[PDB]
Amino acid sequence: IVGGQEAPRSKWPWQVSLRVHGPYWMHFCGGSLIHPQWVLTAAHCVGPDVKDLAALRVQLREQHLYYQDQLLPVSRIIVHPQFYTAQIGADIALLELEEPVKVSSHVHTVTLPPASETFPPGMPCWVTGWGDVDNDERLPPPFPLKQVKVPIMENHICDAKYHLGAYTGDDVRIVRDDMLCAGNTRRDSCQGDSGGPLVCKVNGTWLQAGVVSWGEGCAQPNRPGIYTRVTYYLDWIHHYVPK
Amino acid sequence: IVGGQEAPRSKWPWQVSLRVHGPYWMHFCGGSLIHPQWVLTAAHCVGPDVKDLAALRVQLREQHLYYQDQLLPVSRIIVHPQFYTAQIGADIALLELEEPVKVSSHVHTVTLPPASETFPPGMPCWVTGWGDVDNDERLPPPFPLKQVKVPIMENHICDAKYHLGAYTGDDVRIVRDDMLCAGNTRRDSCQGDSGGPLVCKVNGTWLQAGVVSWGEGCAQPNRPGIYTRVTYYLDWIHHYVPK
Amino acid sequence: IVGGQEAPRSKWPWQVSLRVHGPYWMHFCGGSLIHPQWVLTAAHCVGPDVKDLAALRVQLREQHLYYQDQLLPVSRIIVHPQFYTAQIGADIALLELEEPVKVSSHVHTVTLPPASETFPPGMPCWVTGWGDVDNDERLPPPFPLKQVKVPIMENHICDAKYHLGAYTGDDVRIVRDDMLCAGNTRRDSCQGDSGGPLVCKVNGTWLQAGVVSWGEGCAQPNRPGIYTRVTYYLDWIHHYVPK
Amino acid sequence: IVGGQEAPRSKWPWQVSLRVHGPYWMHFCGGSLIHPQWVLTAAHCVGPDVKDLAALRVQLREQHLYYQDQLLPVSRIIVHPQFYTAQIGADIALLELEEPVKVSSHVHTVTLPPASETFPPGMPCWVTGWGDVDNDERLPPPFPLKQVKVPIMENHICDAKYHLGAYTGDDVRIVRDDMLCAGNTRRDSCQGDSGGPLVCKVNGTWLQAGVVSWGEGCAQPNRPGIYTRVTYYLDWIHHYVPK
Ligand SMILES: CC(C)(O)[C@@]1(C(=O)Nc2cccc(C(=O)N3CCC(c4cccc(CN)c4)CC3)c2)OC(C)(C)[C@@](O)(C(=O)Nc2cccc(C(=O)N3CCC(c4cccc(CN)c4)CC3)c2)O1
Ligand SMILES: CC(C)(O)[C@@]1(C(=O)Nc2cccc(C(=O)N3CCC(c4cccc(CN)c4)CC3)c2)OC(C)(C)[C@@](O)(C(=O)Nc2cccc(C(=O)N3CCC(c4cccc(CN)c4)CC3)c2)O1
Ligand SMILES: [Cl-]
Ligand SMILES: [Cl-]
């Protein structure tokens, strides 16, 4: 997370950390808990190639990475079948836990939006995670969960920005309809934040609008962050995840 | 180039090296001289973001990079306007030299195929360059130009191989129709060979079939190298380059 | 620490971590609290070149680096004046805290030996720190304090081992008389343990025998770790530190 | 070499490159030819630990590293028996070739000084090699041999400079009598230049005064380069190398 600050303990009870086996169980992506047995993340974190399940774990909300880990094994990885790269789109995946978790005030699921929600500019939206704090800069120990308020920008405005300083033809769409754009040069998600949730308050309820997917660098001029638009993928998600 | 060897000095008289200005004029990409004033290369070498022409030069065939440099400036870069990333396609660009090259036996143009030209499966083609000799292993000094023989493979077969050990649905196309596959787990192009030519000898003549574009690593199982198909872009090429 | 394990929270109440200012207060060296206002460490951690005191702090015993930091400033660095490199010797320094530490059971001073104290060969001593767990392998998050039991070895034997597989003439001393050796190919201190304490329990009391100083790598054959011998520097220590 | 420029082909016919086996025969140190079967270098290039002979080769004068290598195997490495680190001193070693080389105008030996020569300030001295061109900056391809004129400074002046900004006591000698100092903030040898020759013209004859040994960084304020003083080691050298 670039900009913003350390998140309070009481906030974002759905944030998860995905971990890959190595010298230690290292954080490589974010995720959100959307049901006690299911985590929603980005496909590019875990695909498109099939990886070994035993080498992946999940860690539910922690204020500080690594310090009191209790890692959770994963029984299935389901990746959107249209997924190949983040720029093509469909950058969405689900992890099913081997056991359901116990919800509580500090750990519980985020609500998905109804299909009709478009999340227009000036909706209040936050993004969270343990990723880099600027291009090339790692989050320092002790690795606090960070959060930042990001302005949503309409898709046609963001597509046109991505064409400024580019060779790509104006009628060749870079930002697609399954995508959502947010952030500016002071406030963006970054590497290590991928797979995490963009959430917006709507009628006093938190809704996950987006999944951190890609961008051109972090907080660069004319390059807002691009998120996978969850409304677009609800049917796919409900093929696997109960209501 | 993976699994190849050093080229004879008489061969590949069309091969070029693109150089970016820093502490030295460093090779980043290959290209092919297709007309006295024109170089064919991959769009991803020089886009999609617009770059400064002063920071770019071209070097014609050299047995060993850096030794006997005579660097040529570029008057124009033309990136295909449908290009945004290699995996979406239109990974093709033209550089216009500021001056015609005086052609000779050591330095001359390669022939573009006719629109009708089908390079049948199994046909022996060759790819050349100064790229990595394996995954994350740089070409050692003195940077000899390497060459390797790679069989062409039908798109259908190549697409299907990219689906093996992947989550992408089998109906969802990875290798697109403006692309061509060639290579295997012993013989491939690699990073720094990008933009370089895939050439086949057809009816005793050398034709350029491909431009090194991308792949999943170099020489991995079921992940042949992927080339921009030059026949697909002949009319765009000839819109700028004299016939 | 190579070949060791995580220390119990009750143990090593004198261990300290020195921190240098950058994007975070990063651990670079260990030390030992020998008096309420004084830390013993290795000169090579803070010299021979003069450094800025504002850029330096001290952290008292912590189970996991970075988590619960309460960083203490330093009023003075005193590097032994005969020090230039570790292999020549006098690798010993004092830091004077700006304030006395309020001592407790969790945080208290270690005892310096008497001048007469010979730590006989084979005696079991312990070394502690947050350094590398092998050659060029960092301590993984969450950075637990490690401990390891290392037998003391006579200088004559240690010197002779350093001569094996070396060109240095056998009459030319490598391990000097202000130094002490301990450790073997399974059990050693490593980079980032520097300045930390080698302690032995003698007649039921913990005495500091050594300061982690240098070695040829960590846990290599015939290259035991080398420590500054604290008895050699007692009078220099007591010239500054209250008895 | 920091400062100065590319050496002319006709100059420094005694310069050698030492090479270590890896992905390619990589340059790690300089040397000088002092007899057709003997090369003089620094001990820290090849010691103090015994290395495998088969993994070391020598390359006689080349204008450009790597381009026309003809590597020469080594039958013995003789390191000064007092050697342990460069700061202690005796940083001098000899390599005996398996065959004698053929001398010529482009390749021949350098003359050693008579024991009486002290090389006082304002002697004209040059140092040469293929090392870094500033702190942390590699010599760029094509790797030309560089040379730089360096001012000699008297030993007591250089020792006092090395004490400025240091904790080391004024009467503790850093620069020793077997050492020689040369260079300033514009003109110095650097990493990769070690083992190479400092030569000075005296009565129209080139004499090797020094062997590039160590320094505090390269071209840093108050830290001239330190060379092993060859006059001091003539007897040792003549135990092995004929007149
Ligand atoms: C891996 C890389 C470098 O290729 C990258 C990529 O990172 N590109 C890219 C595209 C767009 C933006 C950004 C970017 O700047 N960042 C940094 C910030 C990141 C970010 C992260 C989170 C949030 C936000 C929002 N602020 C941003 C996103 C990535 C980066 O490029 C792509 C855009 C094409 C891509 O997404 C991607 O899909 N890469 C990819 C796809 C498929 C394969 C490979 C792959 O394995 N390759 C590439 C091809 C190589 C190769 C080269 C020549 C010849 C051959 C012959 N076989 C092979 C071998 C290695 C790589 O990844
Ligand atoms: C390797 C290093 C970093 O320790 C270095 C060193 O480089 N120091 C040094 C000292 C003085 C100047 C410079 C310097 O700035 N440079 C860069 C420029 C170079 C240069 C090169 C050519 C020409 C010129 C002239 N312009 C300069 C010279 C080195 C550097 O430090 C020394 C001065 C002590 C030394 O010369 C040296 O002898 N090093 C050394 C000696 C013996 C062993 C080891 C060694 O293997 N170590 C160090 C100790 C480590 C360790 C740490 C804690 C605990 C344990 C427990 N067993 C082990 C393990 C790894 C290292 O090398
Ligand atoms: Cl086909
Ligand atoms: Cl002893």
PDB file of C-alpha atoms in Angstrom, chain C residues 13-222:
ATOM      1  CA  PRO C  13      18.276 -11.181  29.899  1.00  0.00           C
ATOM      2  CA  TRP C  14      21.408  -9.111  28.977  1.00  0.00           C
ATOM      3  CA  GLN C  15      21.170  -9.541  25.192  1.00  0.00           C
ATOM      4  CA  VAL C  16      20.808  -6.368  23.147  1.00  0.00           C
ATOM      5  CA  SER C  17      20.264  -5.442  19.558  1.00  0.00           C
ATOM      6  CA  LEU C  18      21.923  -2.434  17.942  1.00  0.00           C
ATOM      7  CA  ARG C  19      19.945  -0.669  15.292  1.00  0.00           C
ATOM      8  CA  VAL C  20      20.931   1.662  12.466  1.00  0.00           C
ATOM      9  CA  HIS C  21      18.520   4.261  11.055  1.00  0.00           C
ATOM     10  CA  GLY C  22      17.185   3.762   7.480  1.00  0.00           C
ATOM     11  CA  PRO C  23      13.697   2.874   6.166  1.00  0.00           C
ATOM     12  CA  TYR C  24      13.471   1.167   9.584  1.00  0.00           C
ATOM     13  CA  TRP C  25      15.678   0.732  12.657  1.00  0.00           C
ATOM     14  CA  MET C  26      17.443  -2.286  11.389  1.00  0.00           C
ATOM     15  CA  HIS C  27      19.436  -4.744  13.492  1.00  0.00           C
ATOM     16  CA  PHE C  28      23.039  -4.947  12.497  1.00  0.00           C
ATOM     17  CA  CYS C  29      24.886  -6.198  15.637  1.00  0.00           C
ATOM     18  CA  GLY C  30      24.348  -7.682  19.081  1.00  0.00           C
ATOM     19  CA  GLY C  31      25.733  -6.476  22.380  1.00  0.00           C
ATOM     20  CA  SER C  32      25.540  -7.235  26.102  1.00  0.00           C
ATOM     21  CA  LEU C  33      24.287  -5.081  28.898  1.00  0.00           C
ATOM     22  CA  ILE C  34      27.181  -5.143  31.428  1.00  0.00           C
ATOM     23  CA  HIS C  35      26.043  -2.288  33.662  1.00  0.00           C
ATOM     24  CA  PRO C  36      22.754  -0.331  33.809  1.00  0.00           C
ATOM     25  CA  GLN C  37      24.061   2.349  31.544  1.00  0.00           C
ATOM     26  CA  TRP C  38      26.523   0.381  29.470  1.00  0.00           C
ATOM     27  CA  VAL C  39      26.547  -2.014  26.514  1.00  0.00           C
ATOM     28  CA  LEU C  40      29.523  -4.114  25.451  1.00  0.00           C
ATOM     29  CA  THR C  41      29.809  -4.866  21.722  1.00  0.00           C
ATOM     30  CA  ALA C  42      32.370  -5.381  18.957  1.00  0.00           C
ATOM     31  CA  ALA C  43      34.337  -2.410  17.627  1.00  0.00           C
ATOM     32  CA  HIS C  44      33.899  -3.504  14.042  1.00  0.00           C
ATOM     33  CA  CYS C  45      30.161  -2.985  14.379  1.00  0.00           C
ATOM     34  CA  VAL C  46      30.687   0.733  14.881  1.00  0.00           C
ATOM     35  CA  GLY C  47      34.201   1.511  13.560  1.00  0.00           C
ATOM     36  CA  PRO C  48      36.923   2.145  12.766  1.00  0.00           C
ATOM     37  CA  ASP C  49      35.312   5.078  10.938  1.00  0.00           C
ATOM     38  CA  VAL C  50      33.504   7.537  13.148  1.00  0.00           C
ATOM     39  CA  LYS C  51      29.701   7.323  12.927  1.00  0.00           C
ATOM     40  CA  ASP C  52      26.777   9.604  13.818  1.00  0.00           C
ATOM     41  CA  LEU C  53      25.119   8.751  17.181  1.00  0.00           C
ATOM     42  CA  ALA C  54      21.640   9.908  16.095  1.00  0.00           C
ATOM     43  CA  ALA C  55      21.648   7.165  13.467  1.00  0.00           C
ATOM     44  CA  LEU C  56      22.187   4.536  16.220  1.00  0.00           C
ATOM     45  CA  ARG C  57      19.953   2.953  18.890  1.00  0.00           C
ATOM     46  CA  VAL C  58      19.772   0.057  21.194  1.00  0.00           C
ATOM     47  CA  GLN C  59      17.036  -2.435  21.922  1.00  0.00           C
ATOM     48  CA  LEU C  60      17.060  -4.561  25.071  1.00  0.00           C
ATOM     49  CA  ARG C  61      16.120  -8.139  25.209  1.00  0.00           C
ATOM     50  CA  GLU C  62      13.276  -8.922  22.829  1.00  0.00           C
ATOM     51  CA  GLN C  63      12.052 -12.381  21.926  1.00  0.00           C
ATOM     52  CA  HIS C  64      11.390 -11.297  18.246  1.00  0.00           C
ATOM     53  CA  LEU C  65      13.101  -8.336  16.570  1.00  0.00           C
ATOM     54  CA  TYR C  66      10.949  -5.409  15.540  1.00  0.00           C
ATOM     55  CA  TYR C  67       7.703  -6.464  17.186  1.00  0.00           C
ATOM     56  CA  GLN C  68       7.639  -4.597  20.456  1.00  0.00           C
ATOM     57  CA  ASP C  69      10.459  -2.129  19.904  1.00  0.00           C
ATOM     58  CA  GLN C  70      11.362   0.444  22.599  1.00  0.00           C
ATOM     59  CA  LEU C  71      14.504   1.904  21.180  1.00  0.00           C
ATOM     60  CA  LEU C  72      17.042   3.615  23.504  1.00  0.00           C
ATOM     61  CA  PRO C  73      19.390   6.368  22.380  1.00  0.00           C
ATOM     62  CA  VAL C  74      23.164   6.314  22.957  1.00  0.00           C
ATOM     63  CA  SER C  75      25.221   9.156  24.480  1.00  0.00           C
ATOM     64  CA  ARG C  76      28.629   7.832  23.585  1.00  0.00           C
ATOM     65  CA  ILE C  77      30.444   5.257  21.525  1.00  0.00           C
ATOM     66  CA  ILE C  78      33.883   4.192  22.766  1.00  0.00           C
ATOM     67  CA  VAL C  79      35.842   2.052  20.342  1.00  0.00           C
ATOM     68  CA  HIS C  80      39.055   0.557  21.592  1.00  0.00           C
ATOM     69  CA  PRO C  81      41.808   2.887  20.156  1.00  0.00           C
ATOM     70  CA  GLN C  82      44.033   0.001  19.017  1.00  0.00           C
ATOM     71  CA  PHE C  83      41.199  -1.278  16.811  1.00  0.00           C
ATOM     72  CA  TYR C  84      41.445  -1.114  13.045  1.00  0.00           C
ATOM     73  CA  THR C  85      40.192  -4.608  11.830  1.00  0.00           C
ATOM     74  CA  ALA C  86      38.940  -7.686  13.600  1.00  0.00           C
ATOM     75  CA  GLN C  87      41.843  -9.890  12.479  1.00  0.00           C
ATOM     76  CA  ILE C  88      44.431  -7.522  14.029  1.00  0.00           C
ATOM     77  CA  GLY C  89      42.424  -7.416  17.272  1.00  0.00           C
ATOM     78  CA  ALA C  90      41.095  -5.111  20.000  1.00  0.00           C
ATOM     79  CA  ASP C  91      37.644  -5.744  18.499  1.00  0.00           C
ATOM     80  CA  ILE C  92      35.746  -4.297  21.429  1.00  0.00           C
ATOM     81  CA  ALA C  93      33.568  -1.293  22.025  1.00  0.00           C
ATOM     82  CA  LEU C  94      31.375   0.304  24.680  1.00  0.00           C
ATOM     83  CA  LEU C  95      28.128   2.180  24.215  1.00  0.00           C
ATOM     84  CA  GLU C  96      26.969   4.475  26.991  1.00  0.00           C
ATOM     85  CA  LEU C  97      23.165   4.719  27.147  1.00  0.00           C
ATOM     86  CA  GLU C  98      21.621   8.126  27.756  1.00  0.00           C
ATOM     87  CA  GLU C  99      19.704   6.688  30.754  1.00  0.00           C
ATOM     88  CA  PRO C 100      20.161   3.833  33.170  1.00  0.00           C
ATOM     89  CA  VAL C 101      18.036   0.815  32.386  1.00  0.00           C
ATOM     90  CA  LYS C 102      15.639  -0.076  35.243  1.00  0.00           C
ATOM     91  CA  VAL C 103      16.797  -3.643  35.785  1.00  0.00           C
ATOM     92  CA  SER C 104      14.459  -6.579  36.388  1.00  0.00           C
ATOM     93  CA  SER C 105      14.498 -10.432  35.959  1.00  0.00           C
ATOM     94  CA  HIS C 106      13.623 -10.135  32.284  1.00  0.00           C
ATOM     95  CA  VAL C 107      16.210  -7.377  31.686  1.00  0.00           C
ATOM     96  CA  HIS C 108      19.465  -7.428  33.666  1.00  0.00           C
ATOM     97  CA  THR C 109      23.243  -7.130  33.325  1.00  0.00           C
ATOM     98  CA  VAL C 110      25.652 -10.004  32.730  1.00  0.00           C
ATOM     99  CA  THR C 111      28.678 -10.523  34.960  1.00  0.00           C
ATOM    100  CA  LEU C 112      32.221  -9.848  33.616  1.00  0.00           C
ATOM    101  CA  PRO C 113      34.705 -12.415  34.649  1.00  0.00           C
ATOM    102  CA  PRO C 114      37.526 -11.741  37.082  1.00  0.00           C
ATOM    103  CA  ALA C 115      40.957 -11.106  35.516  1.00  0.00           C
ATOM    104  CA  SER C 116      42.110 -14.486  36.791  1.00  0.00           C
ATOM    105  CA  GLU C 117      39.313 -16.420  35.095  1.00  0.00           C
ATOM    106  CA  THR C 118      40.557 -19.119  32.717  1.00  0.00           C
ATOM    107  CA  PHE C 119      37.735 -20.740  30.827  1.00  0.00           C
ATOM    108  CA  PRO C 120      39.142 -24.180  30.355  1.00  0.00           C
ATOM    109  CA  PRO C 121      38.952 -26.004  26.958  1.00  0.00           C
ATOM    110  CA  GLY C 122      35.857 -28.077  26.385  1.00  0.00           C
ATOM    111  CA  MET C 123      33.837 -25.909  28.795  1.00  0.00           C
ATOM    112  CA  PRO C 124      30.231 -25.432  27.520  1.00  0.00           C
ATOM    113  CA  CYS C 125      29.423 -21.851  26.682  1.00  0.00           C
ATOM    114  CA  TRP C 126      26.544 -20.300  24.858  1.00  0.00           C
ATOM    115  CA  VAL C 127      26.251 -17.668  22.218  1.00  0.00           C
ATOM    116  CA  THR C 128      23.082 -15.810  21.329  1.00  0.00           C
ATOM    117  CA  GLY C 129      21.831 -13.541  18.652  1.00  0.00           C
ATOM    118  CA  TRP C 130      19.698 -12.753  15.640  1.00  0.00           C
ATOM    119  CA  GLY C 131      22.247 -13.405  12.966  1.00  0.00           C
ATOM    120  CA  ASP C 132      22.240 -15.557   9.874  1.00  0.00           C
ATOM    121  CA  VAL C 133      21.365 -19.237  10.309  1.00  0.00           C
ATOM    122  CA  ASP C 134      23.991 -20.326   7.766  1.00  0.00           C
ATOM    123  CA  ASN C 135      26.387 -18.880   5.198  1.00  0.00           C
ATOM    124  CA  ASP C 136      24.487 -16.188   3.311  1.00  0.00           C
ATOM    125  CA  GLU C 137      21.087 -17.210   4.746  1.00  0.00           C
ATOM    126  CA  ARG C 138      19.171 -14.592   6.750  1.00  0.00           C
ATOM    127  CA  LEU C 139      17.258 -15.273   9.954  1.00  0.00           C
ATOM    128  CA  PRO C 140      13.616 -15.617   8.688  1.00  0.00           C
ATOM    129  CA  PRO C 141      10.725 -13.660  10.111  1.00  0.00           C
ATOM    130  CA  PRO C 142       9.596 -13.496  12.940  1.00  0.00           C
ATOM    131  CA  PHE C 143      13.338 -13.101  13.917  1.00  0.00           C
ATOM    132  CA  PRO C 144      13.433 -15.147  17.111  1.00  0.00           C
ATOM    133  CA  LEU C 145      16.487 -14.761  19.315  1.00  0.00           C
ATOM    134  CA  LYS C 146      18.577 -17.902  18.886  1.00  0.00           C
ATOM    135  CA  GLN C 147      21.017 -19.644  21.184  1.00  0.00           C
ATOM    136  CA  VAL C 148      23.591 -22.322  20.696  1.00  0.00           C
ATOM    137  CA  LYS C 149      26.049 -24.262  22.841  1.00  0.00           C
ATOM    138  CA  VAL C 150      29.620 -24.001  21.648  1.00  0.00           C
ATOM    139  CA  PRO C 151      32.640 -25.643  23.325  1.00  0.00           C
ATOM    140  CA  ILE C 152      35.642 -23.366  24.075  1.00  0.00           C
ATOM    141  CA  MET C 153      38.837 -24.374  22.392  1.00  0.00           C
ATOM    142  CA  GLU C 154      42.439 -23.462  23.338  1.00  0.00           C
ATOM    143  CA  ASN C 155      44.061 -20.742  21.214  1.00  0.00           C
ATOM    144  CA  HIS C 156      46.967 -22.976  20.216  1.00  0.00           C
ATOM    145  CA  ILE C 157      44.596 -25.555  18.756  1.00  0.00           C
ATOM    146  CA  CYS C 158      42.420 -22.909  17.138  1.00  0.00           C
ATOM    147  CA  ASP C 159      45.450 -21.172  15.576  1.00  0.00           C
ATOM    148  CA  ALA C 160      46.673 -24.454  14.150  1.00  0.00           C
ATOM    149  CA  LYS C 161      43.301 -25.249  12.637  1.00  0.00           C
ATOM    150  CA  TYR C 162      43.260 -21.874  10.843  1.00  0.00           C
ATOM    151  CA  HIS C 163      46.596 -22.879   9.340  1.00  0.00           C
ATOM    152  CA  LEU C 164      45.165 -26.063   7.799  1.00  0.00           C
ATOM    153  CA  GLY C 165      44.367 -25.607   4.109  1.00  0.00           C
ATOM    154  CA  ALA C 166      46.062 -22.185   4.203  1.00  0.00           C
ATOM    155  CA  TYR C 167      49.318 -20.702   2.873  1.00  0.00           C
ATOM    156  CA  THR C 168      50.056 -18.625   5.989  1.00  0.00           C
ATOM    157  CA  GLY C 169      53.234 -20.004   7.561  1.00  0.00           C
ATOM    158  CA  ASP C 170      52.710 -22.159  10.675  1.00  0.00           C
ATOM    159  CA  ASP C 171      54.867 -19.796  12.799  1.00  0.00           C
ATOM    160  CA  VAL C 172      52.632 -16.818  11.827  1.00  0.00           C
ATOM    161  CA  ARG C 173      49.886 -16.245  14.246  1.00  0.00           C
ATOM    162  CA  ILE C 174      46.295 -15.896  13.012  1.00  0.00           C
ATOM    163  CA  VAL C 175      44.436 -16.247  16.309  1.00  0.00           C
ATOM    164  CA  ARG C 176      45.919 -13.632  18.603  1.00  0.00           C
ATOM    165  CA  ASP C 177      46.144 -13.589  22.400  1.00  0.00           C
ATOM    166  CA  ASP C 178      43.391 -11.046  22.865  1.00  0.00           C
ATOM    167  CA  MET C 179      41.095 -13.621  21.139  1.00  0.00           C
ATOM    168  CA  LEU C 180      39.318 -16.830  22.049  1.00  0.00           C
ATOM    169  CA  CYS C 181      37.897 -19.629  19.845  1.00  0.00           C
ATOM    170  CA  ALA C 182      34.775 -21.576  20.147  1.00  0.00           C
ATOM    171  CA  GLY C 183      32.473 -23.632  17.881  1.00  0.00           C
ATOM    172  CA  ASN C 184      32.620 -26.273  15.152  1.00  0.00           C
ATOM    173  CA  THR C 185      31.010 -27.294  11.808  1.00  0.00           C
ATOM    174  CA  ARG C 186      27.608 -27.762  13.404  1.00  0.00           C
ATOM    175  CA  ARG C 187      27.466 -24.975  16.024  1.00  0.00           C
ATOM    176  CA  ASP C 188      28.599 -21.348  15.526  1.00  0.00           C
ATOM    177  CA  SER C 189      27.797 -17.675  15.541  1.00  0.00           C
ATOM    178  CA  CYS C 190      27.397 -15.865  12.192  1.00  0.00           C
ATOM    179  CA  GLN C 191      26.989 -12.455  10.546  1.00  0.00           C
ATOM    180  CA  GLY C 192      24.605 -10.260  12.627  1.00  0.00           C
ATOM    181  CA  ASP C 193      25.627 -12.043  15.832  1.00  0.00           C
ATOM    182  CA  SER C 194      28.721  -9.817  15.931  1.00  0.00           C
ATOM    183  CA  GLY C 195      29.200  -7.958  19.178  1.00  0.00           C
ATOM    184  CA  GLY C 196      27.019 -10.403  21.005  1.00  0.00           C
ATOM    185  CA  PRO C 197      28.065 -12.288  24.078  1.00  0.00           C
ATOM    186  CA  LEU C 198      29.730 -15.652  24.598  1.00  0.00           C
ATOM    187  CA  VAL C 199      28.778 -16.634  28.109  1.00  0.00           C
ATOM    188  CA  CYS C 200      29.674 -19.599  30.351  1.00  0.00           C
ATOM    189  CA  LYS C 201      28.116 -20.799  33.591  1.00  0.00           C
ATOM    190  CA  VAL C 202      30.970 -21.074  36.066  1.00  0.00           C
ATOM    191  CA  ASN C 203      30.461 -22.193  39.668  1.00  0.00           C
ATOM    192  CA  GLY C 204      26.724 -21.728  39.117  1.00  0.00           C
ATOM    193  CA  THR C 205      27.154 -18.128  37.673  1.00  0.00           C
ATOM    194  CA  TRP C 206      26.883 -16.739  34.121  1.00  0.00           C
ATOM    195  CA  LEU C 207      30.089 -15.005  33.054  1.00  0.00           C
ATOM    196  CA  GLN C 208      30.768 -13.216  29.781  1.00  0.00           C
ATOM    197  CA  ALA C 209      33.898 -14.753  28.246  1.00  0.00           C
ATOM    198  CA  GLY C 210      33.682 -13.357  24.720  1.00  0.00           C
ATOM    199  CA  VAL C 211      32.333 -10.957  22.185  1.00  0.00           C
ATOM    200  CA  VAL C 212      31.469 -12.366  18.742  1.00  0.00           C
ATOM    201  CA  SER C 213      34.206 -10.933  16.519  1.00  0.00           C
ATOM    202  CA  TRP C 214      35.016 -12.912  13.287  1.00  0.00           C
ATOM    203  CA  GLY C 215      35.801 -16.188  11.556  1.00  0.00           C
ATOM    204  CA  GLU C 216      36.181 -17.660   8.037  1.00  0.00           C
ATOM    205  CA  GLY C 217      32.560 -18.022   7.193  1.00  0.00           C
ATOM    206  CA  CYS C 218      30.273 -19.740   9.689  1.00  0.00           C
ATOM    207  CA  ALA C 219      30.539 -23.426  10.637  1.00  0.00           C
ATOM    208  CA  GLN C 220      33.274 -24.275   8.054  1.00  0.00           C
ATOM    209  CA  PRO C 221      35.799 -27.083   8.595  1.00  0.00           C
ATOM    210  CA  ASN C 222      38.821 -26.092  10.667  1.00  0.00           C
TER     211      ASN C 222
END
